[PDB]
Design a protein around this ligand. Structure first.
Ligand SMILES: CCCCCCCCCCCCCCCCCC(=O)OC[C@H](COP(=O)([O-])OCC(O)COP(=O)([O-])OC[C@@H](COC(=O)CCCCCCCCCCCCCCCCC)OC(=O)CCCCCCCCCCCCCCCCC)OC(=O)CCCCCCCCCCCCCCCCC
Ligand SMILES: COC1=C(OC)C(=O)C(C/C=C(\C)CC/C=C(/C)CC/C=C(\C)CC/C=C(\C)CC/C=C(/C)CC/C=C(\C)CC/C=C(\C)CC/C=C(\C)CC/C=C(/C)CCC=C(C)C)=C(C)C1=O
Ligand SMILES: CCCCCCCC/C=C\CCCCCCCC(=O)OC[C@H](COP(=O)(O)OCCN)OC(=O)CCCCCCC/C=C\CCCCCCCC
Ligand SMILES: NC(=O)C1=CN([C@@H]2O[C@H](COP(=O)(O)OP(=O)(O)OC[C@H]3O[C@@H](n4cnc5c(N)ncnc54)[C@H](OP(=O)(O)O)[C@@H]3O)[C@@H](O)[C@H]2O)C=CC1
Ligand SMILES: CN(C)C(=N)NC(=N)N
Ligand code: SF4
Ligand code: SF4
Ligand SMILES: [Zn+2]
Lengths: 376, 115, 112, 125, 48, 176, 208, 341, 96, 97
């Protein structure tokens, strides 16, 4: 189904066209990611997170890397942290573009999809230049980042950031004050703050309902405590307010990108601990200890001290968390993945009370569900 | 522990009562399953398969295990009634595409190393 | 006075002080049934009397909100209602009793 | 109050394993032998439960090693022989238990290499 | 090449009408470019 | 800090009321949307003329795999199985034995391109730069088996793309 | 300074320890153990029948307003008598904190459903049942959520094989998809990666 | 045996069954069923085809990677026949048309092609050869189809003395001719029958049973040079059979007698179609002809297969011919036809 | 230097070639066998032997960081050449 | 880009903004695909003296979690997990949209 994101079976009970109950059937994209992670090492499990929410790739990677670093009791270098924040905001722009444009496409607007996807192509070019893969970079790793930026990436990112506010303004010229868009989105899928908190919504859902909560402000990670940005807050808790919140979050991510570009520091890109992060190629090919550590890291991997952690980040779709349990070996014993879309899709039924089929389409769009992360 | 927490049904009598209730629920459903899914099997075949699936767990002597089995049976039934399943799964109950696995020692010896 | 609380589903209350006094008095009344040595009774009585003292000494709603540090006065009222319901449930549950049962010999060991 | 079940625990009907792999499988509970190529003994701390070896054949294409045994790579770790035995019994597989082999204490003396009248004297260093 | 065009259309290729033993007047492939011109066309470098 | 996205209120003065009434009766924002769409119509499209124009790429690009050689012609791979060990998808199979001259060389080196996730860990773990992920990406096949590469196919890919692979490695090896 | 070593937060460690003592004193009937990890994460191990009272307290108490149920999962440890370990991760927005509550259960012992405390517990407990076989007593709708219709066995258990027991394909004779016993063209290769040398002296266990 | 031909596994999709079979006419009804069974067993299958490669697409998912090989062949090309049978130890012959095209006739498809396949297979050293014929293959039969069948059977036995010649009666299945041909007479008003179908007795055989028998004949070591007859368990009059077909299809049944010469002229009219003809004079002759009784020849019970009665698998074929009114009617709703035993 | 088997099938550098009676040769019918015509053993034989006036030599494969890890070869046994085994390169002390 | 002035003026009128100030196509303003070679910084732990791994071993500083309360083994004020979150201040940059 075009509006079902391809892999969602939504068994609906309709009286005419009014919705009586929604029964989302998920698992059509269940792969057994957690079991496979239990069978892989820590370095071999990063692409699994890369493929969980395939619209916020470096965000998933950053969450996993934060969990592993917290368990390892190490610290990424400041340049690595700044790169992580910059690319996290770039990925937030990517995800918000995808969400808003697919929402408008499910409602009946496609030209913003095409424009913002040209912008997405440019950001994919940034991804590919920094990593070699257009979307599934596998770039952010426990201890920092894999490789340093090329010598034109910052200038190109500055050019793109400079020429993107006009794109957002053109998007807003088509939907924000349009009466048809307001009719479709206003007072649709209204969720109260208490209901959102009880159902476990996170991120844009809470902020649209009016809850002043943002993990980047309350529980900062990396260098998010050194950047300045505003947190959009909704008033009516509907699709229109959530769309406005997402657009303003795009603008604030542009702010953060500008700040990161100006404040990019020098230094190394991964923790200077060859027992955790691999050494350079020259050191490997000239130093005996470096060769031994490269061999061991790429065959057995680093051992993580026993313990369990739950680390969460403000991924573009809400609070994305990982509960990682290590038994002292080089492979994770348990890896539970908390995707924000799981609770939202669980709460889809309540938000679609007294609505119709088109309203349910709009509510799914405003929930912004990715079933890779929903099912895992 | 000596005082194991019961799921329900307490002793084995109430567990048997729940087993019989679930058996009645399944038995009255086979004609509807055949009609809706447009199965090519007979109603007698469906009832026989329900009977066989019930009988393969006849050796259970633990009330908690019986309660879990009837819970999962009710889950399977509610999957069938709501047409959540397809003809694919209902026929998966029948193993219609498997070759008849040999069971005698001589045939097992001939085919391979399987005990 | 204020138009909205900024939270969907949270209506503005025109009588914050009276409602807060009533709720805190009800909570204190419920806590009287709990045995004296129970640690839930002491802490909850302390915090309730501490917060009930503030509402009787500050007529201004904004300064009262700043003193309570519990969000807006509507959020404080909602939390008082939740505390009252929790006190009733805790009266039913009686969790001040000793431990129900010790776990097996190695239940929380890790790594294992 | 609370019921009592005076019978051995058995969850074979709930695990979902096929009857073939329930009845015709004999697991091996043991402490792994130390890898003789290394002196480290940290891999001989926990008991391991592993299944019997089944057939592996050669793929007609690409010559890979095919298999048909689901439990070929299934190895479980248990802290104690009693725990492993209880798990195997409740899961219904047959099991063979092998006792842990710990090296016997040995008397080592550096001065025995220079004995005045014993054969323990070494001819080189 | 034409640098006045925007990035992406400032380099292009006209494929041959016959390659090896195939009549390639119409059915032009994207894999017909040898590696060096492939690198230059995909802009991994500015040196032809 | 925080900001409100939708918290404004319209002025109720007569001029603003008449402006809103005119916007309601005369579809002003709809005309604005039409104007934006017309502007985009008169703009220049971003479509490239594929396959005659190819999208930009970088020296770090991960494409089809290849097995390289030293300039002398000897194979770089030393059968160390680091790529096989680190491969997340277990898409690499390696079997080796002493060669006729005693070298440590592989006899089987298979990569399943329907199982590989193109993550590039194999070229990171290679200590001799033998296995690489080249720049080619136009290698779609009509049959499944053609995507199950072996040592001969990977060596052919290396010989076919050696110049471009060497140039890319020279361009990007200082960041590794 | 040590650039490669994560700094500690004694203030947060002390606050979490004080709150753990607070909850342990308030609820002696269920709280079996309290821990604070060295990266400032509070954990409470309680008796399995105290799930509802403990969660209700941690949600409604004024000093513990853990309104949001961040996560709910289980961990399978076969070597224990009670293999399944149910984990609740809670977030308190008012006090800007997180807590963890861990209980234990086995195959045949139900765990009281916590959908009356948090609504996300509905789908979280459905997933726990589907993946581990743990039954929740008062669940409004308890059924498989992720596995295939009619799937047998609970995949996330440690004793469930990685590839399962059945695989699907389309059989032209019956004109439908069929499920047949698993058979791999290339078997998954098991690697023994653990080094035989102890890595962390601080986690050494008594030989016993 | 060669080390590559030793069976391995548990007879699944990824196992090795030691069978390398060249299946001529695999792009057909019985051909597709046989190829599916071979691939499910886990055998190497070579599919010689002359049609468009698009029409061979359904055979691809029938086997694991590299087990199905498609090689273009020409019927009158011994070079292509040798190319496709060079490396196979079993050769199955299922080539046959129910009509005669401009380039191929019943002599070509039933005598020349089977003889060429048998002779070339003998030179190539193929261990086993299965050849499909018709049960009512009579040298003096009124039907050119059956005359060519008998002559080609004799030629095949002469060329390859160690052959297994199988004689199915009337295969019925989803993509069959029999049940579909009898159920497609709705469009032409009533059902024309010769002598009202009262002088014809037929026992159709199930397609899956035929395919299983063919597979078992390969694995049976003492079926090298034999002749098997594959017939169903029940014999019906033609009138009763067509009446049961229409009853299961839930279509009104209006039969009427049509004289044999008039029916032959009607068949002559329908065979002028350049495409696949709806019916032909030979088809009318075969339909009117009664199925022979051959007690001395072995059968499905001798090969280890229990013949599936028509009353069980008739609904698989005839449910497609129903309307929305009777689509969901159950299998048991229609009484079995009156048998003649 | 590719060689042809008695069945007409080219042998790879690993000596792989199906037997005459092997059914698996049918996969190459109407298609081709992917064989690399350059043999590394032959090429490295074609490469000459270097002569350096030192007991110990160091080989990194050339190119610095583009080559293999640096190793040291002891040129003391004059009856044979010292072969760096990463790249199969032979060094020798000048005798006579 | 390359366009006539009349079409540019029509686009400016229809869109309401000077498009040539901020376009969506890249014309020679991006960095060249060929760049001078870099020389990345080495790191903090690349010293030749006073650099022992035992003094900078992050993993070995990890400790088993402290057991605050274990059942096996005045008037204290009630506490909280942390001081209550302070109220967020409205943005001075743009408080309202
Ligand atoms: C002629 C069209 C192209 C003109 C430019 C040109 O040749 O550039 C070289 C150009 C090279 O490109 P470039 O210069 O690098 O890039 C352009 C610049 O960036 C510059 O890009 P730009 O977009 O800035 O350039 C636009 C510029 C230059 O472009 C133009 O002027 C566009 C063409 C005229 C538009 C009005 C057409 C009216 C009807 C046709 C007859 C009169 C016009 C033609 C003859 C004029 C004689 C003086 O025009 C203007 O600035 C304003 C023109 C007036 C606009 C009026 C408002 C718009 C609506 C008009 C509606 C007309 C009535 C409805 C249609 C009726 C049926 C056709 O190459 C080509 O054009 C090759 C051919 C491409 C296809 C042409 C197809 C159209 C041909 C005529 C209509 C079809 C008739 C035959 C049908 C056969 C069927 C089998
Ligand atoms: C993950 O998943 C995905 C999603 O989430 C589910 C997504 O959202 C998306 C996003 C998708 C989008 C954004 C796409 C939507 C946006 C768009 C812009 C798509 C727009 C689509 C359309 C406009 C489709 C409409 C067009 C259609 C359907 C084509 C129909 C074509 C026709 C020709 C109609 C038929 C006309 C006929 C038959 C006319 C016939 C005429 C005659 C018979 C007349 C005959 C006349 C004669 C014979 C006269 C002859 C005369 C002469 C002179 C000839 C003589 C010459 C001779 C040589 C003979 C993607 C990609 C996705 O991946
Ligand atoms: C009154 C005349 C009605 C005109 C005929 C209607 C044309 C539609 C017929 C049709 O489409 O089916 C032909 C049908 C099946 O072919 P398909 O449908 O294409 O394949 C799908 C099989 N399930 O052809 C047949 O097999 C029927 C065989 C015909 C034999 C009987 C002919 C007897 C003629 C009537 C005798 C009167 C003469 C005096
Ligand atoms: N079907 C029945 O009722 C009965 C059939 N038989 C016999 O069983 C065999 C299989 O019958 P069935 O599957 O039903 O019939 P089909 O017509 O469906 O199949 C015939 C097969 O032979 C191929 N073929 C036909 N003509 C030629 C030719 N000139 N050269 C090469 N290949 C050719 C066809 O391929 P393509 O797609 O290219 O035409 C197709 O693969 C036949 O020999 C038939 O006589 C025996 C008793 C009953
Ligand atoms: C977001 N994803 C994965 C979609 N498939 N989306 C869509 N609109 N089709
Ligand atoms: S790119 Fe990754 S998945 Fe692919 S072969 Fe290399 S290591 Fe394996
Ligand atoms: S990592 Fe390199 S040298 Fe080692 S086995 Fe793989 S390709 Fe060969
Ligand atoms: Zn060398």
């Amino acid at each position: 189904h075009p509006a079902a994101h391809g892999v969602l079976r939504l068994v609906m009970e309709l009286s005419g066209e009014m919705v009586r109950k929604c029964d989302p059937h998920i698992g059509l994209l269940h792969r057994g990611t957690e079991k496979l992670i239990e069978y892989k090492t820590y370095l071999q499990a990063l692409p699994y997170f890369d493929r969980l929410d395939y619209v916020s790739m470096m965000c998933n990677e950053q969450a996993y890397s934060l969990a592993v670093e917290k368990l390892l009791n190490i610290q990424p270098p400041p340049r690595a942290q700044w790169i992580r924040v910059l690319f996290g905001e770039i990925t937030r722009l990517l995800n918000h573009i995808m969400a808003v444009t697919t929402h408008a496409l499910d409602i009946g607007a496609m030209t913003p999809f095409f424009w913002m996807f040209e912008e997405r192509e440019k950001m994919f070019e940034f991804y590919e230049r920094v990593s070699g893969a257009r979307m599934h970079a596998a770039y952010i790793r426990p201890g920092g980042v894999h490789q340093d930026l090329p010598l034109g990436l910052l200038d190109d990112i500055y050019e793109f950031s400079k020429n993107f506010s006009f794109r957002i303004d053109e998007l807003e010229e088509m939907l924000t004050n349009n009466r048809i868009w307001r009719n479709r989105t206003v007072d649709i899928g209204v969720v109260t703050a208490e209901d959102a908190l009880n159902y476990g919504f996170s991120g844009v859902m809470l902020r649209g309902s009016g809850i002043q909560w943002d993990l980047r402000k309350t529980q900062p990670y990396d260098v998010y405590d050194q950047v300045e940005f505003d947190v959009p807050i909704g008033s009516r808790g509907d699709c229109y307010d959530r769309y406005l919140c997402r657009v303003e979050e795009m603008r604030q991510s542009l702010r953060i990108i500008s700040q990161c570009l100006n404040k990019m520091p020098p230094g190394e890109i991964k923790v200077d601990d060859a027992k955790v992060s691999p050494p350079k190629r020259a050191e490997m090919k000239t130093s005996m200890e470096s060769l031994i550590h490269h061999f061991k890291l790429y065959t057995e991997g680093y051992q993580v001290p026993p313990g369990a952690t739950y680390t969460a980040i403000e991924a573009p779709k809400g609070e994305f968390g990982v509960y990682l349990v290590s038994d002292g070996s080089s492979r994770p014993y348990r890896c539970k993945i908390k995707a924000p879309g799981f609770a939202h899709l669980a709460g889809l039924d309540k938000m679609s009370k007294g609505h119709m089929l088109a309203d349910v389409v709009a509510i799914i769009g405003t929930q912004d569900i990715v079933f890779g992360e929903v099912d895992r | 522990g000596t005082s194991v927490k019961p799921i329900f049904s307490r002793d084995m009598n109430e567990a048997k009562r729940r087993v019989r209730e679930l058996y009645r629920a399944w038995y009255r459903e086979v004609p509807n399953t055949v009609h809706l899914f447009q199965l090519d099997i007979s109603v007698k075949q469906g009832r026989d398969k329900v009977r066989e699936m019930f009988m393969k767990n006849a050796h259970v002597t633990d009330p908690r295990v019986v309660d879990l089995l009837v819970i999962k049976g009710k889950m399977e039934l509610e999957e069938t009634i709501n047409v959540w399943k397809q003809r694919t799964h209902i026929m998966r109950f029948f193993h219609e595409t498997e070759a008849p696995r040999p069971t005698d020692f001589l045939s097992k010896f001939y085919v391979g190393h399987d005990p | 006075l204020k138009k909205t609380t900024g939270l969907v589903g949270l209506a503005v209350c025109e009588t914050p002080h009276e409602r807060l006094k009533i709720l805190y008095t009800k909570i204190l009344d419920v806590l009287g049934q709990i045995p004296k040595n129970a640690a839930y009774r002491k802490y909850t009585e302390q915090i309730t009397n501490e917060k009930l003292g503030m509402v009787k000494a500050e007529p201004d709603v904004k300064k009262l909100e700043e003193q309570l540090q519990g969000g807006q006065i509507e959020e404080v009222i909602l939390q008082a209602e939740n505390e009252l319901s929790l006190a009733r449930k805790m009266l039913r549950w009686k969790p001040w009793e000793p431990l129900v049962e010790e776990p097996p010999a190695n239940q929380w060991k890790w790594p294992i | 109050q609370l019921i009592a079940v005076d019978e051995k625990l058995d969850i074979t009907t709930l695990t979902g394993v096929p009857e073939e792999h329930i009845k015709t499988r004999k697991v091996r509970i043991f402490v792994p032998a130390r890898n003789n190529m290394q002196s480290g003994v940290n891999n001989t701390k926990k008991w391991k439960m592993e299944f019997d070896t089944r057939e592996r054949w050669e793929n007609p294409l690409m010559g890979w090693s095919s298999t048909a045994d689901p439990l070929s790579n299934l190895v479980l770790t248990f802290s104690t022989k009693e725990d492993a035995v209880a798990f195997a019994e409740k899961n219904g597989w047959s099991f063979d238990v092998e006792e842990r082999k710990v090296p016997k204490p040995k008397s080592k003396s550096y001065g025995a290499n220079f004995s005045w009248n014993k054969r323990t004297r070494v001819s080189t260093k | 090449e034409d640098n006045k065009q925007f990035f992406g259309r400032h380099r292009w290729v006209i494929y041959t009408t016959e390659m090896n033993g195939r009549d390639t007047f119409w059915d032009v492939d994207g894999s017909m470019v040898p590696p060096e011109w492939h690198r230059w066309l995909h802009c991994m470098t500015d040196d032809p | 800090t925080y900001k409100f996205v939708n918290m404004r209120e319209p002025s109720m003065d007569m001029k603003s009321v008449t402006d809103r009434a005119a916007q309601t009766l005369l579809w002003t924002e709809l005309v604005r949307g039409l104007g934006m769409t017309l502007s985009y119509l008169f703009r220049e499209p971003a479509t490239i003329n594929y396959p005659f124009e190819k999208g930009p790429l970088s020296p770090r690009f991960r494409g089809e795999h290849a097995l390289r050689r030293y300039p002398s012609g000897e194979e770089r791979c030393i059968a160390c199985k680091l790529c096989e060990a680190v491969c997340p998808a277990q898409a690499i199979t390696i079997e080796a034995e002493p060669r006729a001259d005693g070298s440590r060389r592989t006899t089987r080196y298979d990569i399943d391109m329907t199982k590989c996730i193109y993550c590039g860990f194999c070229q990171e773990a290679c200590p001799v730069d033998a296995i690489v992920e080249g720049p080619n990406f136009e290698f779609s096949t009509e049959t499944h088996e053609e995507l199950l590469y072996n040592k001969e196919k990977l060596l052919n890919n290396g010989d076919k793309w050696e110049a471009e692979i060497a140039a890319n490695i020279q361009a990007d090896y200082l960041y590794r | 300074t040590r650039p490669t070593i994560r700094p500690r937060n004694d203030v947060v460690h002390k606050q979490l320890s004080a709150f753990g003592q607070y909850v342990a004193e308030i609820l002696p009937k269920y709280v079996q153990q309290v821990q604070v990890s060295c990266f400032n994460e509070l954990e409470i191990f309680i008796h399995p029948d105290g799930v509802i009272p403990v969660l209700t307290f941690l949600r409604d108490h004024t000093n513990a307003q853990f309104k949001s149920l961040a996560d709910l999962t289980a961990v399978d440890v076969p070597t224990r008598q009670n293999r399944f370990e149910i984990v609740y991760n809670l977030l308190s927005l008012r006090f800007n904190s997180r807590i963890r509550v861990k209980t234990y259960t086995d195959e045949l012992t139900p765990i009281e459903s916590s959908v009356t405390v948090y609504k996300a517990a509905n789908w979280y407990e459905r997933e726990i049942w589907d993946m581990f076989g743990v039954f929740f007593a008062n669940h409004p709708d308890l059924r498989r959520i992720l596995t295939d219709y009619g799937f047998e066995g609970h995949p996330f258990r440690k004793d469930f094989p990685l590839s399962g027991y059945v695989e699907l394909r389309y059989d032209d004779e019956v004109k439908r998809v069929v499920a047949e016993p698993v058979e791999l063209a290339q078997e998954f290769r098991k690697f023994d990666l653990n080094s035989p040398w102890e890595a962390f002296p601080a986690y050494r266990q008594p030989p016993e | 045996l060669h080390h590559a031909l030793i069976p391995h596994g548990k007879g699944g999709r990824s196992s090795v069954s030691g069978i390398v079979a060249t299946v001529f006419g695999a792009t057909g009804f019985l051909g597709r069923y046989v190829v599916n069974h071979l691939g499910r067993m886990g055998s190497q299958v070579i599919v010689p085809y002359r049609c468009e490669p698009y029409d061979t697409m359904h055979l691809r998912p029938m086997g694991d990677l590299g087990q199905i090989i498609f090689m273009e062949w020409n019927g009158k090309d011994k070079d292509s026949i040798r190319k496709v049978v060079e490396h196979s130890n079993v050769v199955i012959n299922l080539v046959g048309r129910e009509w005669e095209t401009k380039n191929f006739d019943f002599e070509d498809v039933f005598v020349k092609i089977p003889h060429a396949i048998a002779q070339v297979s003998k030179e190539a050293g193929v261990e086993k050869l299965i050849h499909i014929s018709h049960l009512n293959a009579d040298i003096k039969s009124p039907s050119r189809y059956l005359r060519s069948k008998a002559v080609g059977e004799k030629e095949v036995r002469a060329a390859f003395p160690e052959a297994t010649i199988i004689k199915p009666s009337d295969i019925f299945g989803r993509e069959d001719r029999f049940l579909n041909y009898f159920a497609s007479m709705r469009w032409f008003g009533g059902v024309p029958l010769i002598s009202l179908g009262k002088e014809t007795v037929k026992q159709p055989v199930y397609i899956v049973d035929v395919s299983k028998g063919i597979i078992n004949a390969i694995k049976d070591p003492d079926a090298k040079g034999k002749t098997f007859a594959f017939v169903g368990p029940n014999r019906y009059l033609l009138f009763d059979l067509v009446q049961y077909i229409f009853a299961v299809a839930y279509r009104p049944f209006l039969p009427y007698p049509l004289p044999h010469f008039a029916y032959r002229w009607v068949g002559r009219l329908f065979e002028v179609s350049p495409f696949e003809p709806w019916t032909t004079r030979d088809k009318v002759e075969r339909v009117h002809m009664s199925d022979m009784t051959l007690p001395h020849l072995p059968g499905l019970e001798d090969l280890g297969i229990q013949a599936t009665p028509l009353e069980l698998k008739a609904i698989e074929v005839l449910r497609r011919h129903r309307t929305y009114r009777w689509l969901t009617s159950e299998m048991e709703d229609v009484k079995p036809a009156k048998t003649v035993n | 230097g590719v060689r042809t088997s008695p069945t007409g099938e080219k042998v790879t550098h690993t000596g792989q070639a199906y037997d005459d009676g092997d059914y698996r040769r049918v996969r190459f019918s109407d298609r081709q066998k992917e064989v690399n015509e350059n043999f590394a053993i032959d090429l490295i034989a074609e490469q000459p032997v270097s002569e350096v006036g030192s007991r110990v030599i160091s080989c990194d494969g050339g190119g610095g960081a583009l080559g293999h890890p640096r190793v040291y070869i002891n040129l003391d046994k004059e009856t044979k050449t010292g072969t760096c085994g990463y790249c199969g390169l032979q060094f020798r002390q000048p005798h006579h | 880009a390359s366009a006539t002035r009349v079409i540019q003026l029509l686009r400016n009128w229809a869109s309401g903004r000077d498009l040539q100030a901020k376009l969506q196509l890249r014309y020679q303003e991006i960095s060249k695909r060929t760049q001078p070679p870099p020389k990345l910084p080495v790191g903090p732990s690349h010293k030749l003296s006073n650099n022992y791994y035992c003094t900078r071993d992050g993993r070995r500083e990890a400790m088993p979690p402290s057991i605050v309360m274990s059942s096996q083994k005045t008037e204290k004020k009630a506490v909280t997990p942390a001081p209550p979150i302070k109220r967020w201040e409205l943005s001075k940059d743009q408080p309202y949209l």
